[PDB]
Curated annotation (Swiss-Prot), chains A, B:
Gene (name only): PRSS1
Species of provenance: Homo sapiens (Human)
Catalytic activity: Preferential cleavage: Arg-|-Xaa, Lys-|-Xaa
Protein name, per record: Serine protease 1
Effect after changing R99H: In PCTT; suppresses an autocleavage site which is probably part of a fail-safe mechanism by which trypsin, which is activated within the pancreas, may be inactivated; loss of this cleavage site would permit autodigestion resulting in pancreatitis
PTM info: Occurs in a single-chain form and a two-chain form, produced by proteolytic cleavage after Arg-99. Sulfation at Tyr-131 increases selectivity towards basic versus apolar residues at the P2' position of inhibitors that bind in a substrate-like fashion. Although the increase in selectivity is relatively small, it may facilitate digestion of a broader range of dietary proteins.
Record lineage: Eukaryota, Metazoa, Chordata, Craniata, Vertebrata
């Protein structure tokens, strides 16, 4: 997150990190046993960690749980990042408390102008490496499909949307992929891709979770 | 400017010097008829010189134009140097050419990590006095507000930010005040103040021009 701020204490209890030794992506806890992330964060073996704030220093509420099942959306397109969404079944049930809890799926698609919270341990600098210890947060609004298509001519499908600022300055960045865009108590987006970070007229692009609401429930039901 | 270098030719066409008998400050040409500088560079009578490289020897492209109006920010705080910004209307419009051009105002605030270019004819000696003939340039990065607020605990307002190096060595200095800090082709900062030049962990503080974009255009429109 470029241009963000340190997430307050337990303001993001649904945030998880995917790890192969260390964190390579974020994710969102949507069921006591299921995490949604980006399909391009796919790996064969993933350890999910819950309850982290400072990703370097244990604060006591962390849960380390290895993925039991990693199911990337069947129609995921590597080149276009279309259907960039993936479900991870946890090998055991997360323990829900004030530090670890779930986020609701969306009942309606993202509404232009709506304020959302994006979070992650990604790079916080537009150029150069500058990775944060503490979970970063960013309030950004949903942009119109028009502004989104315009910014990325011929790249934007109906399974994507744009949240950010056309002036740049604030944005998601390398390391934030898979993480949550939560608007009005609902997971509307998964951090998907962008053209650089926080560049002018290059807002980040996010998977429209709303299009996958049935696929998620069906997939969870079939794998329970 | 300590630790810098002779700006190349034609690289800083927006740099101006303010003189009320002597070169006391720098400034930026932001309109054919307007200069931004530091409010603490206020004099009742100012002659602006544009197009200077060697501040001692005329090279042919200089324009000498007296200030018609000198408008300091109406909440400028002499004590805190909060709102350290000032607008000067030239008595005639500058001839815009290859060596005297304007610089764009910022469309988004300083994103930390971004390389900037500070410039001026200020003291190049941390200890003592060594004023250069040729304009000095310095590439310096936007420091996180966290790091800025630290170095000057309780001094740093939302109208200020820090550019430079915590190690020391490279920094603006006396006589640089008012001068430009340009990042991505936009005037992000105005040399304002610091504690010591090139001073270890006491980096340069700059007026965040972004917060003044509306005030500036309104003042210019109101005085044209």
């Amino acid at each position: 997150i470029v241009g963000g701020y340190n997430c307050e204490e337990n303001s993001v209890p649904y945030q998880v990190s995917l790890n192969s030794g260390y964190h390579f992506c974020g994710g969102s806890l949507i069921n006591e046993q299921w995490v949604v992330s980006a399909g391009h964060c796919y790996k064969s073996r993933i350890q999910v960690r819950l309850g982290e704030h400072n990703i370097e220093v244990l604060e006591g509420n962390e849960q380390f749980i290895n993925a039991a099942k990693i199911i990337r959306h069947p129609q995921y397109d590597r080149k276009t990042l279309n259907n960039d969404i993936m479900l991870i079944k946890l090998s055991s049930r997360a323990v829900i408390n004030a530090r670890v809890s779930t986020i609701s799926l969306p009942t309606a698609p993202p509404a232009t102008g709506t304020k959302c919270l994006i979070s992650g341990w990604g790079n916080t600098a537009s150029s150069g490496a500058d990775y944060p210890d503490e979970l970063q947060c960013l309030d950004a609004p949903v942009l119109s499909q028009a502004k989104c298509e315009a910014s990325y001519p011929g790249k934007i499908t109906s399974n994507m949307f744009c949240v950010g600022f056309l002036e740049g300055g604030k944005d998601s960045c390398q390391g934030d992929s898979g993480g949550p865009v939560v608007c009005n108590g609902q997971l509307q987006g998964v951090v998907s891709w962008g053209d650089g970070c926080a560049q002018k007229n290059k807002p980040g692009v996010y998977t429209k979770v709303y299009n996958y609401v049935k696929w998620i429930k069906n997939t969870i039901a079939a794998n329970s």
